[PDB]
């Protein structure tokens, strides 16, 4: 049989079949419900919308994310999204395909316990497995050694791995990702008179961020350049025809990744977090870690972020060390690619958690059989 | 057939074929096991590593020496190391080659009894012999008269030999060698803020000791010079790019050989030990012993140690006696060279302990046929 | 004149006058600076806060420890804390009172050199002395023989003393103490969905650890009991009214003292460390050392830790030896009590380092006149 790989991210859902190069279904992980009363009978009206249908009708819906900071908060909507993924997007029967799921490190245990329970009861999957997202990214990188910086919509985390061995004590996790940057961009757009308060407007600001934001090599010099002339100004057309122009907000929004104090957080930036994760490892592997910095996720797709990370790590690392940032063009799907590679391995087939084992042991078996 | 010579030291393993000038396989006598859990499947993961493979992966392994103070303490790891030496390093079948083994004097009898049993049962060697390390050094020196000071990683011992006759009552043994100096250097490096606590860091400190330590002709004058200026300061680059600077610790570490009280030991120094060994011999051979002081082993490779030993022995010996310290440049392999010379001798071929004799007599035959 | 005793620990500062039974000033060794911008003028706003004032306003401050692992890392904040201790807490003039300072063994020399320089220049103290913390604990125990296990917030160390004589070669030091346990508890609280990332939240987790953690006599049996029922579960009320419940984390956090591998460290536990320290001493004093195990410091205040240590040492020691763990109820201030006792001794008054001697010799005199 063919195995299923499902990367349930905070923002997007990636699904497909093991052995493929790219996921087949990529749709937003949103559930939308009407906030206005219907007046016209005879047309199909649903109580909820999932995914692209929710995005298309977002003008009359309230959009709610069931996953927040890599933690599932609404299990009803999560089950709806899983049903949608299994039936309307993949056109498969979950009872005939083992499914591989992903999760961020340092997550609550009940999250994966309930994921296993839902998989084994609601959908009757013959076997399932929960992997750590950064490990899959390293699988997709074709490497057994390196520190992975995976930053998506909810969670930014660091996992150092050397010769296939992970160092759990050096694992870093920070709840600062694309959604926080979108909210900060919404906050800072009010300085030019642009107001976005609803969820659909949040989806518009997210699109603006995806299409106009970039990371500046030097923040203060970029600010001076923006305050000096209008070369950095760009225009964006709203869906109603309105045109907005933004200046320094293009690079101020992703600067929060390196200066978390912009949103009131006391934590250090991603570069200092990676440096601290490297320094917590054994001294004999830091040289290999310095040259194998792997970035994955949507939040790593900002233009010029790899150069900024390389500059900061070089400024933090000793001069004799060689710093190399690895940013493949397809890093937005590295987790799914690595999951498919893992599920397509012959040696992995003995690591599946089957229905009989779950019945014998209960939901607690996921802690034993999964890292 | 060709005979095998194996010098199983506390720190290093020297192996080769009788008749050669240098051993062919020289690798550390360490067994390393992972102390972290693997996360990446599909790659070759072994439960243990032996030798250079353990040194290369020491960042994720715990390193254990199976031989401590010239005494085998872990026979499982010792058998693993012997298997590695026989198969992966020499590429020979032990059933077709007589092997010559080495041992420090005044060792427990069970050590060589179990060595003989392992050789005759696990590897089915046709014949084996156990020699005293210091005698072999005298063989490699091309001498039949002299007192040998052999100091390796575990044991420092003195064996006076005159005209091919040894004096067992004058044999000295002291459990103070390179490993103790490495531990003392680790202890004293904390005075400059440098912390090394793990086994891999111990291997780093051992390398630092090998590359930066030297013996001072006058300890107090050297201390005053070090406290006066920075001429004695030198820098070392850690594997992660960090740079450390050490001053008086360069000559304080090997000073423990002459002042054992630095590590809390009540025994006398190597010079006084050699003088006492000489004085316990007959008065008519002391003149020949004074001029034939032979040094062998890695711990005798410190710069300026021969001059210090000569000065101390001259200060202890009568003025009319002539003191000459013999420190060949290749004394790190003198034991192996002498073992090969002994195994290449025609008259020695009748001294082998064969399988039939061991079967008739048992492990106790090594006490009768070996000194 | 009256002598001052100041135990500058990693976590807390203990100060008072020689001859007293308890220190008069006990406040946290923290310096806090605002991380938000002020908006209301006319009120007293300070650039930094020290001690209890920093604890009270920790919601708008970033808290930094100037002492890390018994080593002073921020001398500006350390000088601020010393000024606070001298003036706002003790209400004394440092120029009129000799001060006694404490330090952990195997510390960098520059630490105490700079401590002496600051005492003799910034505060113009007429005389000062630096003692080893564990020796003072033995003074407070009313003993001249015994091995002291002192574990505070930064350093856990062992010092064996027999008949007033210390054995430096058997002194153990391990950088695993209450702060590491607090960080591990912060890491493991994420399994139940509780997130603490800021310094103030670290102070909250430290309080939770102090009020709810205990050492289990049998770790595996305790884990089975916790996984079987809810008898071990307890509740804690957060300062904002939130209530959290923890189960096995109560005894998993202090288990790191006996299993350092939980935080990725390769070192052995405190029981094995004490056993190795005892075994490195002379065979004729081990019997007296076995019956005089003295514990001091905040990290020794966990319920049931003395019984666990006694069980482990009995399992390691020979059956005919008698193991007695000495855990006085006031061991959180044993270092300060012993310092006051030492400073109140007539024979000690000739061991003070005076201003004239420091001027003649410089900062290097502390190495000669202090152990
Ligand atoms: N080109 C881009 N530039 C900046 N941010 C992007 C880009 N593409 C996607 N993102 C952001 O990355 C996040 C989604 O990436 P993804 O790795 O799919 O997250 P998740 O795994 O949580 O679904 C969103 O916050 C999105 O706004
Ligand atoms: N150049 C050197 N200077 C100082 N010590 C050395 C040097 N080379 C080797 N050593 C020490 O000698 C010991 C190993 O020497 P060796 O004679 O091979 O010992 P063994 O026979 O016990 O293996 C190690 O402790 C090593 O640190
Ligand atoms: N009742 C308790 N249980 C567990 N840990 C405690 C308790 N009381 C204090 N501690 C811990 O001990 C440390 C402080 O003790 P102390 O001996 O004063 O350390 P220091 O000398 O480094 O200031 C802190 O980590 C604190 O959390
Ligand atoms: Mg993701
Ligand atoms: Mg040797
Ligand atoms: Mg203390």
Residue numbers in the entry:
A (entry chain B), B (entry chain C), C (entry chain A): 5 to 375
Sentences from the paper on this structure:
ATP-hydrolysis-coupled actin polymerization is a fundamental mechanism of cellular force generation. Actin polymerization powers fundamental cellular processes, including cell migration, organelle dynamics and endocytosis. After incorporation into F-actin, subunits rapidly hydrolyse bound ATP in seconds. F-actin polymerization is coupled to the G-to-F transition, a substantial flattening of the actin subunit that renders its nucleotide cleft active site competent for hydrolysis.
Replacing KH2PO4 with K2SO4 produced intermediate severing, suggesting that phosphate specifically caused the substantially reduced severing of ADP-Pi–F-actin rather than altering the buffer’s ionic strength. In both nucleotide states, extensive water-mediated hydrogen-bonding networks stabilize the ligands. Water positioning in this channel was largely similar between ADP–F-actin and ADP-Pi–F-actin. Consistent with previous reports, ADP–F-actin rapidly depolymerized within 5 min of cofilin addition, whereas ADP-Pi–F-actin largely remained intact. Despite extensive ordered solvent differences in the nucleotide cleft, these structures feature nearly identical lattices and essentially indistinguishable protein backbone conformations that are unlikely to be discriminable by actin-binding proteins.
